[PDB]
RNA sequence: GAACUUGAGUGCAGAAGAGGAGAGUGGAAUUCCACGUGUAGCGGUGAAAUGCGUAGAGAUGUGGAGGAACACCAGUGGCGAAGGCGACUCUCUGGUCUGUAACUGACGCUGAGGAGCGAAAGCGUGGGGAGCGAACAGGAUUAGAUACCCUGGUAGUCCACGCCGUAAACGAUGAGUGCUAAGUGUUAGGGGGUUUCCGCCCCUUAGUGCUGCAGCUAACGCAUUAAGCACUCCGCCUGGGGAGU
């Protein structure tokens, strides 16, 4: 195939990558810890650089070139894996911004140091 | 007095919309509920899907009434399935 | 800024008139705030008023 | 709203141009204080109408000291007039 | 609602009746009435296939259409009176014609209200449309699991379903017990609540007044003998001396589901 | 006893408000459920581990169930006596402010006792349960860790009615009224000086911020929204503990 949409959900633990196809059929997967990154590490942007190489890799496995990226979640790892999608031998053309923003809805576990 | 806006669901024909819009007006005159006023927007494509739909018929009914038939109107047009919106406002 | 009801002497917003409202709402879906658009306070609350009543008639989004 | 209002006046005029007049003042207090209480048998959760309500009952019943203490045939005419008792 | 008793004695401590406010007469109609034979819970081969049953007051029956057979008739709430053959209160309707029938009495119906009962008749609380033609998420009881046989399902004191969408030649539908089911569009539902609502917060008081409705006694099977029950025996008071506790047969009590397990009806249960 | 209209209130005219109560509806998101994609992780941390996961998870797409709060507006903004009140719509309903002049003509203020409201937790009955979460359990930390952290999770949070009647219930500032420099934002009004306007300026209310003179105060500070200068009324204080026993 030639187009999907690159799902990207960077946390504070994990930046988990997974391409997929556009009415949403995930071709590959690799997240930071699936390179190899247990600790911390998974939530530094290498990690979400080195996690966004494999899924290019695995989708230029399968053939697929002009993305429709779509950051998710609130992390320190999307910038980098952005500009690795690209030099990877992909194509990022939109950039979706998407962290799901509850408009009030439930209320957040409880703040930390009490 | 009211604003009545609805929408009817697009998949509907000519007449039968027709008759929806004779429905909801023979509805709104059993009170006394004065039509003062008509307007058909048409076919608006919806900014976000209703039950399945992007688009949609809107009805605006300008209604002088004694607040009882409006409320006829809310109940049965949470019922009438060939209707996707209705909103009753006060004219004020 | 300048405010836009009163330069152009309109009342009651009429929720009609969805062009207007679709140029006070920002790009996502949002009300802009009264510091963007420069309006009354009054007139700002009869904006949030209209746009929130064509939000629930599909008039205006929630989200983009 | 509106006959009500205008219907009391009209009945409760002792002048022409009484909208004053505790008599008035006091027909409205009770044909208002009735709407309320009926409002309060439908809703009996609301706290806020009741506490209007009792500052109702304080004026009305203020303006019927006044008119105990300046005419008591007009007081007494009154009473028997809205079955205030 | 409930008419609450004072202590004048150790027999009315806790007891509370219904005040039976929504009652307007006490004569039920002739034409109406059927006689009722007590069984004691006993059977064609007279032996007691059901425990702790008969010997209540003698109660006369009321036949009501759970049917719904009628069709576009209109009807009108006479009367709504008391039925000591089911918790609920019965409506007496009378049609046009002079058809004087019984139905279940809906929280909220009073007398002389419209009630038809067609295919094509309003949504409102008294009326009885098939599933095709009721709308999704409405109260719902009376129904019926076969058209035309008269309603089973939703049918007794302050109970209640829900229509929850629709596929097809079938309808879900949310029974009491929280059970999503599947049933044919073309049985007839009534639509509301049930009418006593506060039938469940009663406190019997006596251990006699529960006699008065054909209650016997119950005793456990912990204090019986060991022929009789398997708790009994044990020298004083043993607890459930065997795994799983049992009934007065061989089949444990406690969680052990008591459903077919080739139930040809499964396929129509969605939750449960 | 007679008169008056300023105080008080009715009349008329507008204005604004998350003021209240009942019903209905919405859109995110969260959880759970079913199915496709697909493979080895996810989650979480200061570091990890418990949990979840090849019986196919987390990610992702669609559908459904259900509950609760209502992003942006949103603001020393508004309303309410206080508690408090934020989606939308209707039903009923309370109060306020502004302009007077039509009326009344002192009808006013305060108020022990009484009657009511009264956050949250709690209690009773019946529902409800999505998230959270006392208790409780596991994992960490630690000398110990009945804690903070993490993973789970009961009552409760939610609703109907009834009870409790308590808060750092705060402005740590009782209510009413009058007087006593200014500057300055702002909320709802009114009127004027040119302009039909936009709008600028001036003027006046009632509410709401800040800085500030006199005055007060032990000082901090308050200062026309007083903690000034007075009058009326109520509540309360007379060292700390014991003891709100």
Same mark, same amino acid.
């Given at each position: 195939?030639?187009?999907?949409?690159?799902?990207?959900?960077?946390?504070?633990?994990?930046?988990?990558?997974?391409?997929?196809?556009?009415?949403?059929?995930?071709?590959?997967?690799?997240?930071?810890?699936?390179?190899?990154?247990?600790?911390?590490?998974?939530?530094?942007?290498?990690?979400?650089?080195?996690?966004?190489?494999?899924?290019?890799? @695995?989708?230029?496995?399968? @053939?697929?070139?002009?993305?429709?990226?779509?950051?998710? @979640?609130? @992390?320190?790892?999307?910038?980098?894996?952005?500009?690795?999608?690209?030099?990877?031998?992909?194509?990022?053309?939109?950039?979706?911004?998407?962290?799901?923003?509850?408009?009030?809805?439930?209320?957040?576990?409880?703040?930390?140091?009490? | 007095?009211?604003?009545?806006?609805?929408?009817?669901?697009?998949?509907?024909?000519?007449?039968?919309?027709?008759?929806?819009?004779?429905?909801?007006?023979?509805?709104?005159?059993?009170?006394?509920?004065?039509?003062?006023?008509?307007?058909?927007?048409?076919?608006?494509?919806?900014?976000?899907?209703?039950?399945?739909?992007?688009?949609?018929?809107?009805?605006?009914?300008?209604?002088?009434?004694?607040?009882?038939?409006?409320?006829?109107?809310?109940?049965?047009?949470?019922?009438?399935?060939?209707?996707?919106?209705?909103?009753?406002?006060?004219?004020? | 800024?300048?405010?836009?009801?009163?330069?152009?002497?309109?009342?009651?917003?009429?929720?009609?008139?969805?062009?207007?409202?679709?140029?006070?709402?920002?790009?996502?879906?949002?009300?802009?705030?009264?510091?963007?658009?420069?309006?009354?306070?009054?007139?700002?609350?009869?904006?949030?008023?209209?746009?929130?009543?064509?939000?629930?008639?599909?008039?205006?989004?929630?989200?983009? | 709203?509106?006959?009500?209002?205008?219907?009391?006046?009209?009945?409760?005029?002792? *002048?022409?141009?009484?909208?004053?007049?505790?008599?008035?003042?006091?027909?409205?207090?009770?044909?208002?204080?009735?709407?309320?209480?009926?409002?309060?048998?439908?809703?009996?959760?609301?706290? *806020?109408?009741?506490?209007?309500?009792?500052?109702?009952?304080?004026?009305?019943?203020?303006?019927?000291?006044?008119?105990?203490?300046?005419?008591?045939?007009?007081?007494?005419?009154?009473?028997?007039?809205?079955?205030?008792? | 609602?409930?008419?609450?008793?004072? $202590?004048?004695?150790? /027999?009315?401590?806790?007891?509370?009746?219904?005040?039976?406010? =929504?009652?307007?007469?006490?004569?039920?109609?002739?034409?109406?009435?059927? $006689?009722?034979?007590?069984?004691?819970?006993?059977?064609?081969?007279?032996?007691?296939?059901?425990?702790?049953?008969?010997? /209540?007051?003698?109660?006369?029956?009321?036949?009501?259409?759970?049917?719904?057979?009628?069709?576009?008739?209109?009807?009108?709430?006479?009367?709504?009176?008391?039925?000591?053959?089911?918790?609920?209160?019965?409506?007496?309707?009378?049609?046009?014609?002079?058809?004087?029938?019984?139905?279940?009495?809906?929280?909220?119906?009073?007398?002389?209200?419209?009630?038809?009962?067609?295919?094509?008749?309003?949504? !409102?609380?008294?009326?009885?449309?098939?599933?095709?033609?009721?709308?999704? /998420?409405?109260?719902?009881?009376?129904? =019926?699991? !076969?058209?035309?046989?008269?309603?089973?399902?939703?049918?007794?004191?302050?109970?209640?379903?829900?229509?929850?969408?629709?596929?097809?030649?079938?309808?879900?539908?949310?029974?009491?017990?929280?059970?999503?089911?599947?049933?044919?569009?073309?049985?007839?539902?009534?639509?509301?609540?049930?009418?006593?609502?506060?039938?469940?917060?009663?406190?019997?008081?006596?251990?006699?007044?529960?006699?008065?409705?054909?209650?016997?006694?119950?005793?456990?099977?912990?204090?019986?003998?060991?022929?009789?029950?398997?708790?009994?025996?044990?020298?004083?008071?043993?607890?459930?001396?065997? !795994?799983?506790?049992?009934? $007065?047969?061989?089949?444990?009590?406690?969680?052990?589901?008591?459903?077919?397990?080739?139930?040809?009806?499964?396929?129509?249960?969605?939750?449960?």
């Amino acid at each position: 195939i030639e187009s999907g949409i690159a799902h990207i959900r960077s946390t504070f633990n994990n930046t988990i990558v997974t391409i997929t196809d556009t009415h949403g059929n995930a071709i590959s997967w690799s997240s930071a810890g699936a390179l190899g990154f247990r600790g911390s590490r998974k939530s530094t942007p290498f990690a979400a650089q080195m996690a966004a190489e494999t899924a290019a890799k @695995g989708s230029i496995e399968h @053939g697929l070139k002009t993305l429709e990226v779509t950051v998710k @979640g609130p @992390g320190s790892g999307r910038e980098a894996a952005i500009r690795a999608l690209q030099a990877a031998g992909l194509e990022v053309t939109a950039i979706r911004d998407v962290t799901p923003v509850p408009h009030n809805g439930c209320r957040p576990p409880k703040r930390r140091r009490v | 007095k009211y604003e009545v806006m609805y929408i009817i669901r697009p998949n509907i024909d000519e007449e039968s919309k027709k008759a929806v819009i004779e429905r909801f007006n023979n509805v709104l005159t059993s009170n006394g509920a004065e039509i003062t006023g008509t307007k058909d927007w048409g076919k608006r494509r919806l900014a976000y899907e209703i039950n399945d739909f992007r688009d949609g018929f809107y009805q605006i009914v300008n209604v002088q009434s004694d607040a009882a038939a409006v409320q006829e109107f809310d109940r049965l047009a949470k019922i009438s399935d060939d209707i996707i919106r209705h909103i009753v406002v006060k004219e004020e | 800024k300048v405010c836009y009801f009163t330069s152009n002497g309109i009342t009651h917003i009429d929720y009609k008139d969805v062009d207007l409202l679709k140029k006070f709402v920002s790009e996502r879906g949002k009300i802009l705030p009264r510091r963007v658009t420069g309006t009354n306070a009054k007139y700002q609350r009869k904006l949030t008023a209209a746009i929130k009543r064509a939000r629930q008639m599909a008039l205006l989004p929630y989200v983009s | 709203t509106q006959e009500r209002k205008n219907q009391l006046i009209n009945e409760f005029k002792t *002048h022409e141009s009484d909208t004053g007049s505790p008599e008035v003042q006091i027909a409205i207090l009770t044909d208002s204080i009735n709407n309320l209480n009926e409002h309060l048998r439908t809703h009996k959760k609301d706290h *806020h109408s009741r506490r209007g309500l009792l500052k109702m009952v304080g004026k009305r019943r203020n303006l019927l000291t006044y008119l105990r203490n300046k005419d008591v045939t007009r007081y007494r005419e009154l009473i028997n007039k809205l079955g205030l008792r | 609602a409930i008419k609450k008793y004072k $202590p004048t004695s150790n /027999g009315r401590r806790g007891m509370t009746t219904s005040d039976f406010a =929504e009652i307007t007469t006490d004569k039920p109609e002739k034409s109406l009435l059927a $006689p009722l034979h007590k069984k004691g819970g006993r059977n064609n081969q007279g032996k007691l296939t059901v425990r702790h049953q008969g010997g /209540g007051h003698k109660r006369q029956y009321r036949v009501i259409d759970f049917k719904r057979d009628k069709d576009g008739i209109p009807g009108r709430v006479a009367t709504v009176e008391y039925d000591p053959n089911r918790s609920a209160n019965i409506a007496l309707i009378n049609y046009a014609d002079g058809e004087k029938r019984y139905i279940l009495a809906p929280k909220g119906i009073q007398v002389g209200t419209e009630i038809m009962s067609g295919p094509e008749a309003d949504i !409102k609380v008294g009326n009885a449309l098939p599933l095709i033609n009721i709308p999704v /998420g409405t109260v719902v009881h009376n129904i =019926e699991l !076969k058209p035309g046989k008269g309603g089973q399902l939703v049918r007794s004191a302050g109970t209640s379903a829900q229509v929850l969408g629709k596929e097809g030649k079938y309808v879900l539908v949310r029974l009491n017990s929280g059970e999503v089911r599947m049933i044919l569009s073309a049985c007839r539902a009534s639509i509301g609540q049930v009418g006593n609502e506060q039938h469940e917060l009663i406190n019997i008081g006596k251990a006699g007044r529960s006699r008065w409705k054909g209650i016997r006694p119950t005793v456990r099977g912990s204090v019986m003998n060991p022929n009789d029950h398997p708790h009994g025996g044990g020298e004083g008071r043993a607890p459930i001396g065997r !795994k799983s506790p049992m009934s $007065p047969w061989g089949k444990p009590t406690l969680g052990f589901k008591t459903r077919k397990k080739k139930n040809k009806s499964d396929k129509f249960i969605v939750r449960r």
